[PDB]
Design a protein around this motif. Structure first.
Motif, PDB file in Angstrom:
ATOM      1  N   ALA A 267      -7.752  26.481  21.760  1.00 40.71           N
ATOM      2  CA  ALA A 267      -8.396  27.615  21.060  1.00 40.71           C
ATOM      3  C   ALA A 267      -9.917  27.605  21.294  1.00 40.71           C
ATOM      4  O   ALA A 267     -10.451  28.680  21.664  1.00 40.71           O
ATOM      5  CB  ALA A 267      -8.056  27.568  19.587  1.00 40.71           C
TER       6      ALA A 267
ATOM      7  N   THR B 244      -5.053  35.515  20.401  1.00 38.35           N
ATOM      8  CA  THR B 244      -6.403  34.915  20.512  1.00 38.35           C
ATOM      9  C   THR B 244      -6.995  35.405  21.831  1.00 38.35           C
ATOM     10  O   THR B 244      -7.673  36.408  21.791  1.00 38.35           O
ATOM     11  CB  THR B 244      -6.371  33.394  20.323  1.00 38.35           C
TER      12      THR B 244
ATOM     13  N   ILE C 274     -12.197  35.980  13.050  1.00 37.20           N
ATOM     14  CA  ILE C 274     -10.808  35.532  12.730  1.00 37.20           C
ATOM     15  C   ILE C 274     -10.804  35.128  11.251  1.00 37.20           C
ATOM     16  O   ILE C 274     -11.764  34.458  10.863  1.00 37.20           O
ATOM     17  CB  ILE C 274     -10.322  34.370  13.629  1.00 37.20           C
TER      18      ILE C 274
ATOM     19  N   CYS D 123      -9.602  38.666  21.724  1.00 35.83           N
ATOM     20  CA  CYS D 123     -10.996  38.187  21.676  1.00 35.83           C
ATOM     21  C   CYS D 123     -11.702  38.516  23.005  1.00 35.83           C
ATOM     22  O   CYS D 123     -12.892  38.854  22.967  1.00 35.83           O
ATOM     23  CB  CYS D 123     -11.064  36.728  21.220  1.00 35.83           C
TER      24      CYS D 123
END
Lengths: 322, 335, 317
Positions: free
Chosen positions: A101, B69, A92, B73
């Motif tokens: 997260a 995300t 990222i 991922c």
């Protein structure tokens, strides 16, 4: 064949049990034994790469690199250390709260490399990740892996920093932005564990923070290396570079390093810079044999390979012939 | 065998080779059991630190034209854990990445370099264009307000872990689910609704007026319940609020209210505080209820509910690794 | 002889097509075909394991960047990627990795990178208009359909039409240079002020002279496709580049001139093959994809085989 392990007790199996899934947020998260292990293991990785031998000593691990500010050298150094070790990395480079997260990212990967311009978020992420975190960043705070590779560079030219001998003292000048420089803060704290003297060179608003001096002073006193000559402050490079083994320069027209301004330094002095640079170091110093900043960046690969190997292995086998 | 159900894996893998998975209706009952079977096996493997590398030396292109995300991922990690390789696109404009060149061109070209593409785009339409000119299989990771079939599969795996009887189509064993939040734009709701409507399931649809489930999803649900004799007038109920909506459901499915689709913050604000889940608002729920959220989350679920054994959304996220490894293996193995 | 050529190629940068000599071209084309054979039959392709590359792309070039990444991965190596002083940047970056693929719209930055890099760089497009791996895959595409460009046979002459924006068409300049190394004759199709530059015609005339292949028929200039496309083995089409015209009006009275249709292809040769380096803005109408004379997507395919070929030759051992 004679590495520092023929010089100090380095029980690399005990230390690796202690480092198994260790997070490294601040340089004080790494102890004497852990530093020895990293330096020994960095030296092995250097010898392996430089002889083009198999470096895949951490296959089948998966890291997430999260870099929320531009990096280059450090991001590409970690990515490279991971790939050379035979592991893979997802990346990222930029609602969701920090803890959610890291809770989710940590279900998918074995480890997280984290850079954030925020100083606080790394603590948050360390408390929600089910997986170890390596601080690559954390703006104005600390840069532990920078410290370790700086130390490795310094240990390579000045083996005696490790000896803790009252009589063999290393003198280092830090120059530039000492206030904001997380590389200075990290390396100060690390060096101050050893027989080291510090010249801090800068202009008033950028002076080394009071509480870094308190940590240096604390740590020097703990090993009986503290005196009123331990920590001197300086306006210029003339005064500031005198009798220093190490010149460490930092980012930010008042502290530009030239072959002229190195004439009256020790013969054996070594110049470091974590990089990148603007005008702090003139081109012509690259060709001075006291410039080693490019070997330093190179060392970042061996040292980040070593750290990753020590934190996440024996779960191949070993660059521990131990 | 799922306990009672044989899958012939040979037959079904032949039937899945080079299949593109765009909408949940691209996946049939036999294929779903193959996906749920294989998912549990990758779960068992990763949990016993066993070798997962059973789709080695494949090369996927992941193309994400909007933030992600969890989804991006998990896919990358499914790919790496399986032993394959991935090149990433993360241009945060569909119009950057195309820059003048038609989608059909961009996919005819990109498809020559790789073995499969994972594709997310805020546009509904582009995925169909990609699919019709791609020479390799495409897995839709989300086509705007449309659908999100790999979310469906990992949701249903999650729901099936806790209520194995959704698979039985037993008239006496009905799953009741509450969907809460943006049902109009919830690509997540659209895929799981459709899927769930193939079994004995009733639907509570909790939302504000201009976010209610689309009409055409209420058609698909109705038709599918009727097809199997599980439709009555109580199947599908619509609700103002969480008191009425969360009564007697096995599954509470919360959605993120999309800020990123609202010309007026006070229009967004009045609605993002509308359906907030606390332990209080869980007091009058069945003992066995399980909470799912496709994540990320903002206000929708209070942090206190993490510590509730009714909360499984972290387990749901984890499950997505096992399901994407499963979908990739079944579609892309060789000989 | 593969191993003589390799040793000369090991640790070679490739910035300009002129950096590749005849015997290097021969090795590249022999190896590109080896890889095409392997990938087509789903055989193991992992003939460059355990090498690390950096891809620096400082402009959108998404196909090219994706082709190089896929080449690196199919070969069995790994790649880290950068996306948006330069000599500092490359000194550091090159201690970490085995090789760099660089793309920069800057003329000035690629020369600087090559001089500070301790590791071979491969140009993936720059400011001087050089794009050698495009030229090599273009050339490999021609060689697939006309094996004889290599023979330097006075009797077997290849004929190529270049069409569109020959003025700004950097891929045309590059490929011309390479093609004029061989028995080749050139139809340049454009409107006057988008003509092939003066000084490209000149390097072409030089090369054809060097190898005794120049006559008064070597280079013809054309108004229109009817005439332009007459007896040519190869049609190389090009983006009319809006990009490079300040004011969109000057561009519009120049973008509509040369559109390839099935109608404008009726009266070409049977064997003729249509290349385009792409993207394209439908100066080739979609109907031509289904014409067995279109090979532009196989051309894009070949980039994988050629970029794999190159990496293999520069970095093995």
């Amino acid at each position: 064949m004679f590495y520092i392990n023929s010089k100090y007790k380095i029980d690399l199996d005990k230390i690796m049990t202690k480092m198994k899934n260790k997070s490294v947020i601040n340089i004080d998260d790494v102890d004497d034994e852990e530093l020895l292990a990293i330096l020994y293991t960095s030296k092995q990785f250097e010898k392996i790469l430089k002889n083009n031998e198999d470096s895949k000593y951490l296959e089948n691990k998966v890291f997430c690199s999260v870099f929320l500010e531009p990096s280059t050298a450090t991001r590409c150094s970690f990515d490279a250390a991971i790939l050379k070790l035979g592991s893979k990395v997802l990346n990222i480079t930029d609602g969701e709260t920090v803890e959610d997260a890291f809770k989710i990212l940590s279900t998918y990967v074995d480890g997280i490399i984290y850079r954030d311009p925020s100083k606080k978020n790394v603590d948050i992420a360390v408390s929600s990740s089910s997986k170890p975190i390596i601080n690559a960043g954390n703006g104005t705070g600390e840069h532990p892996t920078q410290s370790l590779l700086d130390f490795y560079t310094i240990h390579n030219y000045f083996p005696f920093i490790l000896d803790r001998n009252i009589n063999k003292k290393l003198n280092i000048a830090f120059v530039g932005d000492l206030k904001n420089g997380r590389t200075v803060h990290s390396l100060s704290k690390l060096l101050s564990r050893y027989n080291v003297s510090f010249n801090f060179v800068s202009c008033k608003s950028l002076n080394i923070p009071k509480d870094i001096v308190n940590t240096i002073t604390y740590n020097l006193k703990k090993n009986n290396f503290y005196s009123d000559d331990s920590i001197k402050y300086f306006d210029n490079l003339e005064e500031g570079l005198e009798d220093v083994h190490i010149i460490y320069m930092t980012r930010i027209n008042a502290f530009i390093l030239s072959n002229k301004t190195l004439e009256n330094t020790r013969d054996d002095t070594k110049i470091l810079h974590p990089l990148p640079r603007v005008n702090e170091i003139k081109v012509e110093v690259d060709s001075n044999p006291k410039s080693v900043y490019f070997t330093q960046a190179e060392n970042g690969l061996y040292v980040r390979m070593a750290l990753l190997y020590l934190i996440f292995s024996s779960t191949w086998s070993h660059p521990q012939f131990e």
